[PDB]
Amino acid sequence: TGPGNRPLKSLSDLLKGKQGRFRQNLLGKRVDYSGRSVIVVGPQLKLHQ
Amino acid sequence: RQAITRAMADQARTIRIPVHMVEVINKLGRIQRELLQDLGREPTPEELAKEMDITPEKVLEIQQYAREPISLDQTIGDEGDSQLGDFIE
Amino acid sequence: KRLKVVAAFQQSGNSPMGMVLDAVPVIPPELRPMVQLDGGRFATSDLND
Amino acid sequence: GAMLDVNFFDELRIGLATAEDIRQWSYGEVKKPETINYRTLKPEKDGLFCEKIFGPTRDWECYCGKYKRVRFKGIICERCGVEVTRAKVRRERMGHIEL
Amino acid sequence: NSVPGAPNRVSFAKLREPLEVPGLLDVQTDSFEWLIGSPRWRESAAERGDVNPVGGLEEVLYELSPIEDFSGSMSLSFSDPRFDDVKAPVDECKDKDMTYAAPLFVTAEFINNNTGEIKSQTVFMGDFPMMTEKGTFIINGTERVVVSQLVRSPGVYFDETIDKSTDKTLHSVKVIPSRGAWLEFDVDKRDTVGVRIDRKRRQPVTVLLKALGWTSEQIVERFGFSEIMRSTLEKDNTVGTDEALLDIYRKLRPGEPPTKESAQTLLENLFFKEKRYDLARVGRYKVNKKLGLHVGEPITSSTLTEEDVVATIEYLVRLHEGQTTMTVPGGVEVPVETDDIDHFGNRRLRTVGELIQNQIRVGMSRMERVVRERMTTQDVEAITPQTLINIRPVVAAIKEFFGTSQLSQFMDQNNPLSGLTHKRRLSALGPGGLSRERAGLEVRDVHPSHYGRMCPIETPEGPNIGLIGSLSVYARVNPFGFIETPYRKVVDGVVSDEIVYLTADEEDRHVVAQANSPIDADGRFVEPRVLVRRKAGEVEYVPSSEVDYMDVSPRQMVSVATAMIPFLEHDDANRALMGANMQRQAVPLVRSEAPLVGTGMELRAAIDAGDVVVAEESGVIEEVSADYITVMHDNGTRRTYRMRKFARSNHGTCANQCPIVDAGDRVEAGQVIADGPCTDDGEMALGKNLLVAIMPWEGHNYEDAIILSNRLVEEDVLTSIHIEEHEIDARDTKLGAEEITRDIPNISDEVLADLDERGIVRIGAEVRDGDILVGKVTPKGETELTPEERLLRAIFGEKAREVRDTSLKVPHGESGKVIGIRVFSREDEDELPAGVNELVRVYVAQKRKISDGDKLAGRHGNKGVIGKILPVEDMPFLADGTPVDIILNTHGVPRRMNIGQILETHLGWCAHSGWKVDAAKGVPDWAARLPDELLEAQPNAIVSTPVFDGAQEAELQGLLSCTLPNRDGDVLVDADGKAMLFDGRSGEPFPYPVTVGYMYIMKLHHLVDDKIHARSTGPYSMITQQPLGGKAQFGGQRFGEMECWAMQAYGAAYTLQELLTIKSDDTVGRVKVYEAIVKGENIPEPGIPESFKVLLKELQSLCLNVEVLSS
């Protein structure tokens, strides 16, 4: 442990995927060219818009 | 005791500091705690400087030398899924 | 259950002598950096300790 | 083995790594638990950031500074002791610890 | 009534509630002044028994004194904690970041036994925080709120989980104290006992009883009926006390040579020596009440007793025999029964006083083991208590509590109601309490003892349902940490007024009536049979002879927020929950209109929010302004209330207070004298009153969306101010010193036009994304130039300017005026963190209009992002040309069971147009039991239907049938409550009448501008080479595993390779792609990702030979 009694994070824990006994989510890479927002219904659009 | 304090000087910081700088920093620490108990508040830079016969310029330099690195693997969010390393441009 | 690992070492061209570690390797310095936040503070990688 | 990692991966084989390989990857026994000179903020010799082993922290620049251009590459300043080359070999090279 | 500055809000309530709503912040303020020992508490305790009142600090010191060395030759003792006045007043604390505190002085005392002396001083104990008048701690200038917490009260607990594999009932027990070691007294599958002590996995009870100082004959004697006891005592296979003592020992800890004589102390030192085992005063009270041991004497000596252990075991065996009552020797017989660890008779409430006392205790322990530590290293006949006492652990413990502790939260103040409701919060999660995942589905449920104590409706709808509650309106915390509740004790069917605060347990013993019971105007009931709440929460009809406690008034089972939902009893608990959680998220508008329809709570819970300047002592206004009011009291002395004008809240919302009186008026004490953020004339007002239809108009209001009139945007009916706090500092670097000034590296003069002569912007200058809010420059040193750069510098003849440019440019997508600048300086002697010289903060403000994407939502949970802001002309208008403000959808009404919105809509139209019940020939039948002074009601007249006692549906129809016309002969709303809206766009009328009405809708704090975000190339993480994360920086949205699955299921390979290689990790791929786009070439083929290479070196670091093989 270090300060705050948090166990030091060794090499066995730095493996990125590293599923333990229970299968948790990967959650990925944070791509660029991205962006979110809130949506609103667009009833004048065509289906492919 | 001399061996153990030597060891605590050498092998106790991630960025090693020679022994004499550790002695001056520990003198600074003693003077800060005792002057805290006495003044009732944590003393000032110039106050500690005048107290240790050094410059109030130099005291800040010693304080900067005496700052230990904070780990890059402390989960920043209370919801712990983001290492602190994931937030350094 | 023993034959499992035994045939594992036999069949392959390995040798169980590799299990006892004689020389530890050191991960490259960049994968365990010591970056400084602006303002003198340092941020190690917790493997340096 | 194709370590240069360009588009060709027909297999990716694992295997328990003996000492004869572990000390064959490494580019120098690190033998001082020193991280950075507290004041100059350069890596310590034989430390866990030793430029002599892991590589140069500055693109095409030795440690003593006696070489500072691409025209001197692949060579090693015989006084400081660093392969004057790109500053991302600190991302690839490894060191070992003779127990 | 009963509040002098009240607006006359007529009310439909049929009942006359005896008790008035309590001092809504008592749960905070009384707890803290307990912990202090203020004279207010000092008298309040005496007002109800309280044999010995002891302040929290007093209790901590009286459990610390004395401090004695191993020798016991010298003694240290504390006493008399006294607070001097605070060191900085509240506003200045909040300004300069000073944590509003006050010093502790503690009259220590050192006594040497061998020779005999006293070393009595007045020690300084440390700057102690101090609750403000609003029950909120200010910390470092921020304003925090310690949250009340729930835990299982330490006591004796009893359960029997049936082993169907055996078909036997397995009773058990856990004596869990506040601190110490557990112990269970099971009854195994086999007909024996299980006596696991301190988690040591196995024991028969007879072993413990023998170790306790019993013989086998003594145990046979004391256990006469005890069948399983005598059985185990026959298979106990261990005789002689010492004989087990060693059993116990040996297993007490493995690997130790026992001293059979000496380990006796270890036992009498786990459960009895009152320094390492202390179920607190709560625990002792609980045990003595469960076993009826010390029934009539004061509680103390919190450690267990052999009588306690024997009584527990005997009661356990009688429980696993089938019994009704056990009569311990010397104790009143008490009912034999198992306990429920969720029932509020066992789930106490560590209020803020309790929490702070725990932290001071955990600090004083460290201080104790430095006192007794240096108690001997120092030389005797020379020490002073000042040299013994070290306060640093205490001060560190406190300071690390208030900051950085999941019960010390930022005061969630984005309106007075949220400020009020973060206080009065019960959170079962926290240190000591159970965590989230470890907490099963059981505790989330609503045990029927929560009635009247913890509101079953209000709770966070996220993944914390049940783990965060708010208190009922009338509840009150038991001095032990239980949640008492008021009742009206009734005798002989004669409802008295002797208001009794029944706790969580004694409610079960009784039978509890209902508030809406037909009292016969004297305390006599009317009907013979009455509903009642029996012990386990079952409902029955008892005749009016058993009923001994009736509810103080309805809406007793409902929290502060949920009491403010009109027509609550019509909505389903789902949407009512969502409403009570979205009603704490409205943002304080610039205009702050009060609602046509409400409950009673809009006023009382608005002066209790704190954010309404209240006339202290009754007097006369002497002079006003938009900044201060000077009330001349009746006798001489005056007072000037300083308005908070545009203070940034903790979430970016304005906090104006404009005064609402005139220079000649006369205010009574306790009166509202200055509106707050969301108060209108004192009462709550979290939104506006907007004419609403209920038709689905042109698909834009599709599936919870909303269309709006543009009138909202023109007349600023929905318009929030926002005030963001930007902050940069000038640090001391190794190379030099950072410097704030107009001197900047290569830069135009236009972008440095708004700055003043010394860096910081000019107060008032409008800014936009990319402006220089604080011109700040730092040295850079030297770098070997690029020779092309050197040629350009030559051809233009510019210098190097080795100072690098790190100025405070306003972040992306922010604008608006610069309200004010607050600048600090090390030179000006103001304190700052080390290595800092000049800390400048630039308060910026912007007046966000409403806009599509924003999240409006009624009071009934019915929410939805604004869909489209129609122009005013193409909005379905009434017959008077009056447009409609918003247009909800019908398909959201039925399947959500929130017809509260419809009933509110009709009652709002009645409250608007004003009605006049034609009492020409007597009074109409529906209005037989309406209150008087509701026969006629003026236009725009507010009303109020309190929660579970409000307008009945019949009353609504009856009002609505007579709804007096507007200006022409025009009753725009037919008796059904609808109208013939004319289409604004096409022109024809709609073929069927549509509902209209005034529905009170808030503006939730999920504005678009706080959400929208985009990135094309931004910063990059240091450790991993990925884009950075979150809207704080640019960052890019996560691309998890589920999206990888989706884009594979499509079979899109190249897009997946893109998203995982040359948008996240291909380090040389990024610049190549950016070049390819900018020049118009072809996007190159992506290289190996970066995370793979890092993973490869980590695996090779684990001594795992990993090696690519080409062929």
Added chain:
Amino acid sequence: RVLRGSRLGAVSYETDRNHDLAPRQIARYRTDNGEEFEVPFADDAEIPGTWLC
């Protein structure tokens, strides 16, 4: 709010000229346990006798 760091090393970005390079010798050193290691030194440089290979 942003917090940026920086490794203590500059980033010079010329082009990786593969042709015009300062010529350099090769000195093969031997450790004690019969190991041969090779070191490209600059031409004009006293090839040091010992070396931490």
